[PDB]
């Protein structure tokens, strides 16, 4: 679904991404997608 970024995640960029995810999928997917991106962020940090 989503475009491959190949570019750095600014805070504005992730605000765009999360908003577009909520608008595309609704809460159902995005509440899991964001909750997994939590774990990804923790891992890479």
């Amino acid at each position: 679904n989503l475009v491959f970024h190949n570019k750095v995640i600014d805070g504005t960029a992730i605000k765009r991404l999360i908003s577009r995810l909520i608008d595309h999928f609704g809460m159902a997917y995005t509440s899991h997608i964001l909750d997994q991106v939590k774990t990804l962020g923790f891992q890479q940090a």
Partner: protein, 65 residues
């Protein structure tokens, strides 16, 4: 885990979120009136209503998942 997607599906099904939740409360209180089995342990009447309704949507979920 998955049960909230069913909730969202039913939220997407019903034309008013508040009316949906009212209908769930009604269904649960009439369930706990038409049946007087205790039905209060590891499975709960709310989850039962959600399960039966998603089964009406045709989806293979067991009672209280």
């Amino acid at each position: 885990k998955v049960m909230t997607m069913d909730i969202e599906r039913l939220l997407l099904s019903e034309d008013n979120r508040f009316e949906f939740v009212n209908s769930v409360a009604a269904e649960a209180t009439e369930y706990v009136e038409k049946n007087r089995d205790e039905y209060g342990g590891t499975k709960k009447a709310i989850f039962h209503v959600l399960s039966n309704r998603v089964n009406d949507l045709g989806f293979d979920r067991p009672e209280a998942y």
